[PDB]
């Protein structure tokens, strides 16, 4: 599937988890739309923090 999620409102923490557990064992491609992030490019050295 290509399950797309518009809003995480009534996400029962049990079934809110079960989707992620299905991504790793069924190649499920999921989506979120209400998330904001300011990620930035990092050099080869100094890895991840």
């Amino acid at each position: 599937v290509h399950m797309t999620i518009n809003e995480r409102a009534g996400m029962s923490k049990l079934v809110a988890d079960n989707i992620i557990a299905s991504v790793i064992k069924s190649n499920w491609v999921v989506d979120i739309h209400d998330i904001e992030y300011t990620a930035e490019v990092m050099t080869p050295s100094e890895g991840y923090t």
């Binding site: 409102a9 009534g10 996400m11 029962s12 923490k13």
Partner: protein
């Protein structure tokens, strides 16, 4: 054929219906969680 045990007017000693268990305890009860709607002001009332 066979008149009911009532309306016949004599005392008697007959059978019943039973079960085995404590019946009321299973070690549990309905266990539900409730996720709150996020914040106020954005809740929809208008469904008529």
């Amino acid at each position: 054929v066979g008149i009911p045990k009532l309306e016949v007017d004599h005392i008697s000693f007959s059978n019943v219906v039973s079960m085995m268990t404590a019946n009321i305890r299973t070690g549990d009860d309905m266990a539900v969680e409730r996720v709150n709607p996020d914040d106020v002001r954005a809740i929809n009332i208008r469904n008529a």
